[PDB]
Amino acid sequence: HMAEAALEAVRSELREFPAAARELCVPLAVPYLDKPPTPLHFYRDWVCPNRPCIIRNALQHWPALQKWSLPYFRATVGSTEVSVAVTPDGYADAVRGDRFMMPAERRLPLSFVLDVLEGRAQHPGVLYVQKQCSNLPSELPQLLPDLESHVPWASEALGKMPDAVNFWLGEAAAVTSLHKDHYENLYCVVSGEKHFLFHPPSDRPFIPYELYTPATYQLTEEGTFKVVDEEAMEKVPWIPLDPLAPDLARYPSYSQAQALRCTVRAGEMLYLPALWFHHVQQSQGCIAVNFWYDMEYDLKYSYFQLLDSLTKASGLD
Amino acid sequence: SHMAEAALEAVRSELREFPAAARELCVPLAVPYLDKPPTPLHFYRDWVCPNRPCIIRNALQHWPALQKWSLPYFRATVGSTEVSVAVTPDGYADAVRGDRFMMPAERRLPLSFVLDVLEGRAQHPGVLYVQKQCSNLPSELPQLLPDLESHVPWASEALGKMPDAVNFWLGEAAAVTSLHKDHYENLYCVVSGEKHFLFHPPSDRPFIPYELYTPATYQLTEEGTFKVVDEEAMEKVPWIPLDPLAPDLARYPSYSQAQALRCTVRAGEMLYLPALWFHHVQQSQGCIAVNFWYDMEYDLKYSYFQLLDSLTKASGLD
Ligand SMILES: O=C(O)CCC(=O)C(=O)O
Ligand SMILES: O=C(O)CCC(=O)C(=O)O
Ligand SMILES: [Mn+2]
Ligand SMILES: [Mn+2]
């Protein structure tokens, strides 16, 4: 009886938190820094308040920035075998139909990827060097001397070294579905550009989540794609909504969230804070590197956990 | 419907678990000690941003006050100075008493008389405490400013701002500061004696009770008795009725699922009391203390605490 009234009160506060939080803590545009910050300034101004920014002139020390290019990769590591994600439509690790679709895993010489990117050669579907798991040192070690194993002022600020360094090189059709990571992320564009769409963690009440049975694409011999359910896998929660084409009929509440878009260009470094929902688009053959630092699990993390569970518990998700 | 009653219980269940879940990750079992002042970066990353307390030793060695300051030294130095003194019948200024938020009687007495009371050479009705705050050290006792620093340099650099106020504290052992929290980063410097702190983290809010009280002020009558005059001009004030020293578990049973964190801060030591932390304060007789208030950043942790506070009310736990 009366409990229903208490439930709507709780729901109203959860619905009001995302607006309150952004007016106080979320920028109106992802800000630019004229130069790398000091470790103290970085932690106080961006890391602790959990706020994104793009740092200019932070890679001028990197040999890679003057050297890296599709022709340079061909000459330098063309024969190196790399892991390449293949999908029919360019959405790896994304909800397609009623399944969480995982990429097809293929080993291919880098040279081939470069030909496909340049339109020199074809392949069914969409290619993306996107292995992660610190794929830069793991698969293209010969490129390590062309960059720093870490961002010194950022590593000093956080008091720890990165847990992984990943290399990203994909087709323009290769889109990363909206998701969040429990890492502090420094995303460095060496060539081309990346188009980032953001939601802050405090938008959680309006970001829909559902459980999907996991599946993987299997690439046939006939040049088509099959779906192989991962029968021996626990189910995985994921965000079904496309921020670029949101289904406001199924999840009207996403309109009450507010996305923050931005583009990061070659030579620029983006600080993407921990737990921020992000969706990523790239230019054809974009070359990028990102540094992952495990986040600190403190009051901000415990608070988000409460927000995430209460979003579900209150029936907003 | 029947689902609504079940949904509300799932919410309340998560809220009641949050304080224990949060403290396992974020709240220490005991207040840690530091052997020397930290660097600005270390101070921000280890204590401020994670929002957790510590006591810093050997941080006041540059303060002449640490060698000079004492009850006798003050008498010679500022004994004739008139200062605002809080007076209450029982030693509890800014505390819930019955159906009113009781504010102390503020009187302007020369400091020479306060020292007499503390040393037992003289007597006064009720309990004396110099706690006016509002930066009462530069405002009322400017002669003492040379004996210390106008701010804490390594802390000011870390927080990127200057202190919003510097307060002088001196009171009887019977004068207790009720449990409350501030919207400030607080650096509490004990110059002489000792202060005993009892803490609750912000995340204990689900079980920390709050009520709205009519404000009233004590009035000392010429006969040495205390009258209660209500403050009609102020709107109702929210305050914590509960006494961590004698908890009324019959009235507020839910405090038992909270967990207090106690510690003592001695002369020469500096406590970092993080913003929004609930704290309750006792002092030895004539304890001498100074504290720096830096305004907190109103960031995501503030919004999160505001949400937790609001949810505590919407859900019926408070
Ligand atoms: O670059 C991408 O496509 C994804 C990047 C990402 O997911 C991350 O850095 O956390
Ligand atoms: O010194 C006391 O008794 C209380 C001080 C206090 O409330 C504070 O430092 O914020
Ligand atoms: Mn990511
Ligand atoms: Mn206080």
Side-chain angles (χ1 to χ4, degrees), chain A residues 37 49 125 158 185 192 247 253 289 310:
Chain A
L158 299 167
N185 193 39
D247 198 337
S253 75
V289 174
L310 292 175

Side-chain angles (χ1 to χ4, degrees), chain A residues 2-3 6-7 9-11 13-14 17 20-21 24-25 39-40 43-44 47-50 155-159 201-202 275 296-298 300-304 306-307 309-310 313-315, chain B residues 3-4 7-8 10-12 14-15 18 21-22 25-26 40-41 44-46 48-51 156-161 202-203 298-308 310-311 314-315:
Chain A
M2 276 315 165
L7 183 59
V10 170
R11 283 188 193 199
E13 306 285 303
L14 290 168
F17 175 72
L24 187 57
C25 318
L40 175 60
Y43 195 104
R44 177 179 76 218
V47 185
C48 191
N50 194 233
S155 302
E156 199 187 327
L158 299 167
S202 52
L275 299 190
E296 205 89 46
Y297 299 76
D298 61 0
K300 279 181 280 152
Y301 172 82
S302 299
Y303 272 132
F304 180 83
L306 178 66
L307 182 67
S309 303
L310 292 175
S314 64
Chain B
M3 280 201 81
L8 184 65
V11 168
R12 295 177 166 160
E14 298 281 46
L15 288 177
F18 179 69
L25 271 186
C26 314
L41 174 64
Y44 212 100
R45 179 178 75 220
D46 297 322
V48 179
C49 195
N51 194 238
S156 178
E157 183 75 359
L159 307 174
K161 67 188 66 165
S203 56
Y298 288 100
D299 63 1
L300 187 51
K301 290 194 294 295
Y302 176 77
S303 304
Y304 271 133
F305 178 78
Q306 294 280 119
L307 177 58
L308 178 61
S310 299
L311 290 164
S315 65

Side-chain angles (χ1 to χ4, degrees), chain A residues 31-37 53-60 153 267-270:
Chain A
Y32 286 82
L33 291 176
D34 284 322
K35 60 183 124 172
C53 64
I54 295 167
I55 302 89
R56 300 196 250 158
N57 306 304
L59 313 164
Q60 42 167 263
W153 46 267
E268 301 186 324
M269 173 188 304
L270 165 73

Side-chain angles (χ1 to χ4, degrees), chain B residues 10 33 35 47 92 129 155 160 186 197 199 203 206 234 269 312:
Chain B
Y33 287 79
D35 285 322
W47 311 105
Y92 288 83
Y129 194 1
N186 190 348
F197 289 82
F199 302 140
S203 56
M234 285 178 71
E269 305 181 330
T312 295

Side-chain angles (χ1 to χ4, degrees), chain B residues 63-66 68-95 97-106 108-221 223-250 252-276:
Chain B
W63 285 19
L66 202 65
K68 294 159 60 156
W69 279 15
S70 63
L71 276 44
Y73 173 84
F74 285 154
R75 194 185 289 284
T77 305
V78 287
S80 65
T81 304
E82 302 275 16
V83 292
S84 293
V85 188
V87 190
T88 64
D90 48 307
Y92 288 83
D94 297 323
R97 285 299 155 189
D99 61 356
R100 261 137 185 78
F101 172 73
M102 290 314 318
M103 277 165 292
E106 290 263 317
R108 295 197 62 74
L109 312 165
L111 183 57
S112 43
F113 182 71
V114 182
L115 305 143
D116 284 349
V117 176
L118 290 170
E119 298 169 329
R121 320 166 111 101
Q123 317 292 310
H124 196 274
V127 182
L128 290 179
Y129 194 1
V130 184
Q131 64 180 20
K132 161 153 194 171
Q133 323 147 50
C134 295
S135 178
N136 65 344
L137 176 65
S139 286
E140 304 202 336
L141 293 169
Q143 308 96 318
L144 288 175
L145 295 173
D147 291 337
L148 63 162
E149 282 168 283
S150 61
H151 64 108
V152 181
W154 51 266
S156 178
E157 183 75 359
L159 307 174
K161 67 188 66 165
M162 287 289 291
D164 200 0
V166 181
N167 299 318
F168 181 83
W169 306 83
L170 180 58
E172 305 185 49
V176 178
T177 303
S178 298
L179 194 182
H180 72 285
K181 53 171 180 88
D182 302 301
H183 55 299
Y184 289 108
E185 308 289 8
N186 190 348
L187 296 168
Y188 201 103
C189 312
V190 176
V191 184
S192 183
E194 50 185 70
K195 286 264 175 180
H196 314 271
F197 289 82
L198 182 155
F199 302 140
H200 282 279
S203 56
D204 270 327
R205 171 61 183 99
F207 303 127
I208 300 303
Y210 268 93
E211 304 252 66
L212 282 86
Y213 293 102
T214 296
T217 307
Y218 286 116
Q219 200 185 61
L220 181 49
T221 48
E223 66 188 329
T225 36
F226 288 94
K227 272 164 177 173
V228 179
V229 174
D230 290 357
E231 283 280 320
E232 259 74 51
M234 285 178 71
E235 274 189 345
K236 292 264 173 187
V237 43
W239 205 260
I240 303 166
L242 186 137
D243 176 358
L245 300 188
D248 189 312
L249 299 171
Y252 301 108
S254 66
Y255 179 72
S256 69
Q257 286 300 79
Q259 184 162 299
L261 178 61
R262 308 175 197 72
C263 73
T264 286
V265 188
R266 294 171 180 96
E269 305 181 330
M270 176 191 291
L271 171 74
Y272 168 49
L273 180 42
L276 301 186

